């Protein structure tokens, strides 16, 4: 809504470090939100633009922020394979066992695609391997429908 | 030949008469258009899969029509653009000279065989192949003051009643519409279908069953029985005519005996097919239809017939309907062609009076006033026979030919007036003796000028279609000039002329004529002595030649290239582009601000505004918008501050303050269908199966690397759109069967609720109109109202969308563009103000070599033609120089003499290069044709000097220097007459402001600047070159 | 050209009469000579490329760009594109009480691109700040996605 | 099966709605029977290439 | 001209071929029609020489 | 006839009146073209008139 949040949002998805830090210097709202509820954290995680995500939460950006449906930057980094950002958002206090309206955690989004590195990173930090979405699906049933044997071995 | 038309003058007349009648038979029948068809033909396959995204289209309609466009002749492109509104647009582009009709049938056919590959939802809406011109002769708008109507009522009254009436008009071509004609719309409320245990599928069936047309047959139908006396067609239930009847159709009837209807479930109205285009004429809700003219029709008569068909129907239609004309370009065509006719008649007048200043004889002045019109009318005849038309090109081709037409007349007149004075001969013998000096010179000049202009007609491209108009016109105008100079002009000089006394070089009696003759003889003696002194000393006046040539080459490289100037057509355009995810209300707020500006701050110049939301350029989304700004007549916009060159800058500076909106005001290019701005259409392609995301990465990378070279690249733009937020529903296939739901019912519900469904056709007032079934806006705006939509399982129980589906957000393209089947993204730009275009081309085809693996490039638009050309100008002008040298050796019977003529090219060129730099003009095409005209008349003035000299050295043996002096004395008089007459005829073209100023100036500045120098430098250097070349050989 | 036009103005009356198994495979009408102008071969110098793999690359990346060339009326391919050839087994179809028609319905129900619509559509209501494009189903784009078909 | 007026409202009147924009056309007649059969006969100027 | 357009469009793809692919020309009649006209061009040149 | 009811010719009856309207200009073009040919051949405005 403000002229600083809009610039932050136009710059985060664009991948511009100097401009984002300059916007934050003049007092820009890091927890600004797009019309759908996506902050510069959401965009930096969706497009994998680190050097921005490390730069935002260093200035008080809410890592566990949720959009107008309940998704957090983890859901976006875990659904696309950004390990350098998953191991960072977790280090800065990101709820590994988050849940949106649909009940999907970053486990279901990392297993539906098969990012076993990130699945390891997430189970390292206490991701309930027996949680459920609203359909009654664990990461194990997802690994089985997709037919990935590696994940079947990971979850014992 | 000429000696034939001295004792046989009447014969000459009947030729002149004929080639006047042949001209008059054409000016009545010749079409009048602003510009001809220069662009390469192109046909646009347009389709609409409604309620869709860009990938659905790209993978169902675009990739299909693209694999089946095989076996098309003379093809260059297969461009394509798929949008999120469902509108797909595929653009083919065929070479120049290609027939558009044959191409269009080839496309229509290869598509009619690719139709049963598309879905059953595109066939209903259909695909519409049509030619691309984007050139609206005029737009017609329709307003309601009272405010009772909306867009959808004015549009229907326009379609059902007016579109046909103005399509029968003479020379009207295609007719496009803004808005949509009535379509009955069924807005559903899921909480009422949830009440009666219904879906938006039983509605589809109830409507497809109770609105169809059924066949029965006949009574007494053959084969009949013996004794039947009656046959009569049978008529079962047919289509529905009124909305009220649609409220009577039955969906179900409950066990309690209650009868369910549509009136109890839905809300039925008569609206529009697509609510995405919203037009406003000065805030008033409006509509309108665009008219583009046919091939071989006068724009002026066409517009006068449209304005008449519309007044013939002015009283019939209701109160609250006003017809207005925001966009009309014929008020500019009438001027632009009327301001060159008064130039030609002003030139014939100025040569009527110059020839009474120098010759001082009424009869000797009537001769060019008879020849020049004959030549112009025969030129119009030759244009007609070839199919050409009257344009700003075919007219500015005979304007800057008028010099070659007055020269071939006054050369003949003054030479016989000179012989009659220097030798006391009567007119007949003096003309039979003069034309013996010139009749070979004129033929050689004809060949030379034909060699100078004809190559311009082979330029090979779109620009070739302009150069061809110019070249045909001027070549015809000079071929007829030489003929009337060998056919009519001598017969006129032998009859209308009057004898005078020998030695009477011209004294005058009392007035300006005595002073004039006396000063002219004095200055002729001075010039003769000066040129003699020059001949005594060469080097100087031959080293100055290299100075002039080097300065000309220096000025020729500091002159920006261009195609055609932008001018004040009385109308301009404004573009609005909001951020991604912007709605109709925001864009309409912005367009209200724009209209408020144009109607509050510039109401002294602006007359109207036509704002269209959803009709933008490079996008049809909800985000874009456009405005067609119409201005008062040029008489009401005096000065230079009330022109578009200024209004555009003021509006842009003012709208730079509009926040959250990129607004751009711009004038109209001369060739709308063509590209301009010295730019280039670059485009990346993925030839390795990469996605759209990696291609976007590579594009953003190339851009970040293109701002690194601001020395030759200024504004490297992506013409497309950036990815935006989109909503993903991921159905669970298990829970759709466990609850006993059909997925083809789930998807039908979702689509017919949120996107629309063309169900059937109905009748309204004897016309076919469509039936759309959609959800009421209130229920299809945000997520979290999805769950308000129930689909019925097989068990009879109704389940919400919340039990099946999960939801998510995803950044994904609204616009996906292709190039030759392969994914692609377009890039615009323009070279820095000092650099050329080929340099920028080679740069960013060197920058592209550093892109990821699988990413290639290609050039389109005006950049595709510059690669299949570029070396044509030097080649063609070199063969032209060779033809000139040969045609001049054939004339002088010498291989050496021609150079004395071929060294006056850099004399008339530097003057124009100086004028175009002092007034700030570019290297337009008009400037080039002016350079060529100056070269032509400079060579025409020089060839006769050399002919006279070489003839005095053979017929008389006067000697080299004496002969040269006598020649420059003879030919001084006509040279000044020609130069002065053409300069006066062209001066208005330089003073001109307002209409056709950028063109009249572009022509006359160069013409005059080069003519001054080709006059005051060719009377000193050509004799120097003659004596030099004769000494050297 | 007008010959092809006359010929293809007479098919427009017959295509409605043909089965949807022909129209859906693509009917072709083309001027042509009877002999080959030229044959263009593609090979893998190294290896690791079966005829199928070269045929697909040829049909996808280089065939449609040549048939658009001016002069070329017919282009025959010495191979074939890729395709999700779904080889079935009757002894596993009766074990589950299925048939090919039940596989076909499932495929053309779960591999689909849907006209879902448009969040914040047209005509909207007063006070809407969002516009978005709904996405429900897509084409399965791989081999592991055709296996999860229920 | 359609009657004479249904085809005018559906077929004939929408094709003679598009037949405007053609070169060298002297006239165009039309007929609409009760068997649904429809004819639209366009007559172009002499010398035109059919 | 057609064969030239082709042999060009092919050059427009080689830089994007995977490692290993190679284009071969096992059948082409055009290399015979621009040699059969050349051996007669040089013939009619030898003719004026003689 | 009543108002809003016009008449137009078609078929051979179009060509009949087209020729009836053509002939007047034909007789004039074929007359002012023999005048000019005769004036040319004999170089006198009087011979063609006579």
């Amino acid at each position: 809504g403000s002229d600083l949040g809009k610039k932050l949002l136009e710059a985060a998805r664009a991948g511009r470090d100097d401009e984002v830090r300059i916007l934050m210097a003049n007092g820009a709202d890091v927890n600004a939100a797009d019309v759908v509820g996506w902050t510069p954290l959401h965009l930096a995680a969706y497009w994998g633009h680190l050097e921005i995500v490390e730069v935002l939460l260093k200035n008080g950006a809410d890592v566990n922020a949720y959009d107008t449906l309940g998704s957090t930057p983890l859901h976006l980094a875990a659904h696309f394979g950004h390990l350098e950002i998953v191991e960072v958002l977790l280090k800065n206090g990101a709820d590994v066992n988050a849940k949106d309206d649909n009940g999907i955690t970053p486990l279901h989004l990392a297993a539906n695609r098969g990012h076993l590195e990130i699945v390891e990173v997430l189970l390292k930090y206490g991701a309930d391997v027996n949680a459920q979405d609203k359909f009654g699906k664990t990461a194990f049933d997802i690994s089985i429908n997709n037919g990935n044997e590696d994940l079947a071995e990971i979850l014992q | 030949m000429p000696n034939f038309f001295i004792d046989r003058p009447i014969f000459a007349w009947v030729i002149a008469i004929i080639i006047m009648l042949a001209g008059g038979l054409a000016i009545l029948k010749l079409p009048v258009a602003q510009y001809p068809t220069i662009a390469p033909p192109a046909v646009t396959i347009s389709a609409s899969y409604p309620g869709a995204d860009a990938k659905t289209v790209q993978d169902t309609v675009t990739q299909v029509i693209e694999q089946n466009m095989n076996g098309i002749d003379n093809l260059m492109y297969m461009s394509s653009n798929s949008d999120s509104t469902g509108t797909v647009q595929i653009t083919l582009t065929f070479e120049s000279g290609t027939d558009a009709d044959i191409a269009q049938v080839q496309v229509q056919n290869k598509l009619q065989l690719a139709m049963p590959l598309l879905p059953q939802e595109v066939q209903q809406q259909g695909v519409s192949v049509e030619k691309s011109s984007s050139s609206f002769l005029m737009v017609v708008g329709v307003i309601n003051t009272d405010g009772t109507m909306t867009q959808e009522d004015i549009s229907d009254y326009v379609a059902a009643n007016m579109k046909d009436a103005i399509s029968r008009t003479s020379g009207v071509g295609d007719v496009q519409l803004f808005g949509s004609q009535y379509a009955m719309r069924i807005w559903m409320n899921p909480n009422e279908l949830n009440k009666f245990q219904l879906t938006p599928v039983d509605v589809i069936t109830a409507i497809k069953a109770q609105n169809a047309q059924v066949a029965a047959g006949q009574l007494g139908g053959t084969p009949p029985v013996k004794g039947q006396q009656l046959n009569a067609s049978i008529i079962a239930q047919t289509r529905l005519t009124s909305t009220e009847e649609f409220g009577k159709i039955l969906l179900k009837v409950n066990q309690d005996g209650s009868r369910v209807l549509l009136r109890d479930v839905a809300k039925i109205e008569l609206g529009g097919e697509n609510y995405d285009i919203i037009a406003e004429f000065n805030g008033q809700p409006a509509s309108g239809l665009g008219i583009k003219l046919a091939t071989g029709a006068n724009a002026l008569d066409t517009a006068a017939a449209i304005r008449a068909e519309l007044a013939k129907m002015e009283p019939f239609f209701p109160s609250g309907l006003k017809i207005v004309y925001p966009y009309d370009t014929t008020p500019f065509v009438k001027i632009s062609i009327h301001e060159v006719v008064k130039t030609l008649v002003e030139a014939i007048i100025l040569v009527f009076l110059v020839m009474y200043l120098f010759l001082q004889n009424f009869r000797a002045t009537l001769i060019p006033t008879i020849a020049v019109p004959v030549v112009l009318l025969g030129t119009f005849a030759v244009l007609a026979a070839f199919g050409f038309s009257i344009n700003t090109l075919t007219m500015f081709g005979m304007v800057l030919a008028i010099g070659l037409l007055v020269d071939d007349a006054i050369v003949v007149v003054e030479n016989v007036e000179r012989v009659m004075a220097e030798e006391g001969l009567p007119p007949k013998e003096a003309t039979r003796k003069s034309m013996g000096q010139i009749q070979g010179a004129l033929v050689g000049i004809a060949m030379v000028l034909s060699a100078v202009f004809v190559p311009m007609a082979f330029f090979g491209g779109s620009t070739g279609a302009i150069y061809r108009q110019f070249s045909i016109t001027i070549v015809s105008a000079m071929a007829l000039s030489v003929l009337v100079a060998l056919i009519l002009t001598p017969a006129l000089c032998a009859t209308m002329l009057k004898p005078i006394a020998k030695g009477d070089h011209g004294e005058g009696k009392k007035g300006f004529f005595g002073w004039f003759n006396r000063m002219f003889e004095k200055s002729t003696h001075h010039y003769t002595d000066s040129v003699g002194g020059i001949l005594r000393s060469t080097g100087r006046y031959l080293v100055l030649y290299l100075i002039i040539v080097v300065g000309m080459a220096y000025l020729f490289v500091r002159l920006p290239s261009s195609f055609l100037p932008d001018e004040d057509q009385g109308v301009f355009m404004t573009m609005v582009q909001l951020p991604a995810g912007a709605t109709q209300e925001r864009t309409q707020k912005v367009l209200n601000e724009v209209t408020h500006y144009y109607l509050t701050k510039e109401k002294n110049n602006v007359e109207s505004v036509f704002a269209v939301n959803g009709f933008g350029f490079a996008g049809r989304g909800q985000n874009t918008g456009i405005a067609f700004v119409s201005l008062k007549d040029w008489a009401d916009r005096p000065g230079e501050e009330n022109k578009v060159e200024a209004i555009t800058m003021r509006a842009t500076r003012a709208f730079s303050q509009i926040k959250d909106a990129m607004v751009f005001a711009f004038n109209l290019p001369a060739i709308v269908e063509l590209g301009t701005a010295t730019g280039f259409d670059f485009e990346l392609i993925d030839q390795a199966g990469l996605g759209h995301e990696k291609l976007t990465q590579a594009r953003n990378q190339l851009l970040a690397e293109a701002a690194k070279h601001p020395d030759m690249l200024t504004s490297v733009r992506p013409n497309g759109l950036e990815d935006t937020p989109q909503f993903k529903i991921d159905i669970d296939q298990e829970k759709a069967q466990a609850l006993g739901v059909s997925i083809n019912d789930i998807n039908t519900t979702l689509g017919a609720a949120w996107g629309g469904s063309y169900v059937n056709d109905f009748i309204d007032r004897g016309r076919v109109k469509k039936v759309y079934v959609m959800s009421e806006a209130k229920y299809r705006m945000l997520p979290d109202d999805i769950g308000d939509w129930y689909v019925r399982a097989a068990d009879g129980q109704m389940v919400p969308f919340s039990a099946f589906s999960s939801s998510r957000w995803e950044y994904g393209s609204p616009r996906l563009e292709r190039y030759n089947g392969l994914p692609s993204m377009e890039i615009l730009g323009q070279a820095a103000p000092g650099k050329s275009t080929g340099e920028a081309m080679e740069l960013m085809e060197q920058l592209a070599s550093k892109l990821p693996t699988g990413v290639g490039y290609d050039w389109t638009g005006m950049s595709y033609q510059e690669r299949l050309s570029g070396n044509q100008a030097p080649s063609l002008y070199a063969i032209s120089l060779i033809v000139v040298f040969l045609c001049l050796a054939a004339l002088y019977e010498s291989w050496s003499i021609p150079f004395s003529v071929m060294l006056v090219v850099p004399l008339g060129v530097i003057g124009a290069l100086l004028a175009a730099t002092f007034r700030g003009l570019t290297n337009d095409v008009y400037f080039q044709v002016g350079l060529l005209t100056t070269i032509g008349l400079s060579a025409k003035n020089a060839i006769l000097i050399v002919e006279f000299a070489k003839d005095l050295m053979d017929k008389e043996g006067k000697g080299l220097i004496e002969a040269t002096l006598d020649a420059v004395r003879m030919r001084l008089r006509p040279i000044l007459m020609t130069s002065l007459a053409f300069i006066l005829g062209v001066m208005p073209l330089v003073i001109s402001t307002g209409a056709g100023s950028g063109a009249q100036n572009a022509v006359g500045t160069g013409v005059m600047g080069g003519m001054v120098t080709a006059t005051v430098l060719a009377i000193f250097f050509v004799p120097v070159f003659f004596v030099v070349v004769r000494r050297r050989f």
Side-chain angles (χ1 to χ4, degrees), chain B residues 778-791:
Chain B
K778 180 183 170 180
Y779 297 97
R780 54 154 210 190
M781 309 315 291
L782 298 171
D784 313 311
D785 67 18
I786 303 272
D788 298 341
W789 278 100
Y790 287 13
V791 308

Side-chain angles (χ1 to χ4, degrees), chain B residues 402-593:
Chain B
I402 203 78
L404 276 43
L405 277 59
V406 307
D407 195 0
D408 281 281
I410 66 174
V411 162
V412 194
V413 182
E414 71 89 21
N415 188 344
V416 60
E417 292 291 328
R418 164 182 77 71
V419 170
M420 289 153 52
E422 298 185 354
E423 315 188 11
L425 289 157
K428 273 170 62 60
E429 309 297 341
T431 318
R432 186 174 284 97
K433 196 255 190 176
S434 168
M435 299 307 292
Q437 319 170 350
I438 312 292
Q439 66 195 7
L442 305 199
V443 175
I445 295 157
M447 292 137 76
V448 163
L449 268 52
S450 293
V452 179
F453 292 105
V454 163
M456 206 153 72
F458 298 114
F459 250 33
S462 47
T463 54
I466 314 180
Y467 289 110
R468 195 171 303 148
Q469 304 275 309
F470 284 113
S471 179
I472 300 317
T473 316
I474 303 175
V475 177
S476 315
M478 55 72 70
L480 279 85
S481 179
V482 57
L483 285 180
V484 300
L486 307 182
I487 299 294
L488 174 59
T489 314
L492 289 171
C493 296
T495 312
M496 281 291 126
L497 282 198
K498 199 188 152 183
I500 64 179
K502 181 183 167 89
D504 213 328
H505 288 195
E507 174 51 29
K509 300 287 98 175
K510 60 180 155 152
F512 286 174
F513 295 157
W515 156 259
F516 186 95
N517 274 299
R518 204 190 54 76
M519 63 80 85
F520 201 59
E521 299 322 294
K522 178 256 191 178
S523 173
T524 301
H525 291 159
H526 185 68
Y527 156 89
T528 317
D529 279 349
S530 162
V531 70
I534 295 173
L535 301 202
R536 283 204 310 272
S537 66
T538 55
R540 274 198 62 72
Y541 298 96
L542 199 151
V543 72
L544 304 178
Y545 192 60
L546 308 186
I547 301 285
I548 296 173
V549 175
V550 174
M552 169 180 88
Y554 160 66
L555 289 157
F556 188 81
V557 291
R558 181 177 181 170
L559 204 54
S561 276
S562 301
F563 314 90
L564 274 167
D566 283 8
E567 63 284 28
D568 187 75
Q569 289 176 10
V571 172
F572 66 99
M573 292 193 287
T574 305
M575 270 173 42
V576 187
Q577 177 69 251
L578 273 76
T583 55
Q584 221 169 41
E585 206 191 349
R586 309 182 51 190
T587 317
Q588 209 64 225
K589 284 168 187 165
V590 172
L591 287 158
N592 301 138
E593 199 286 328

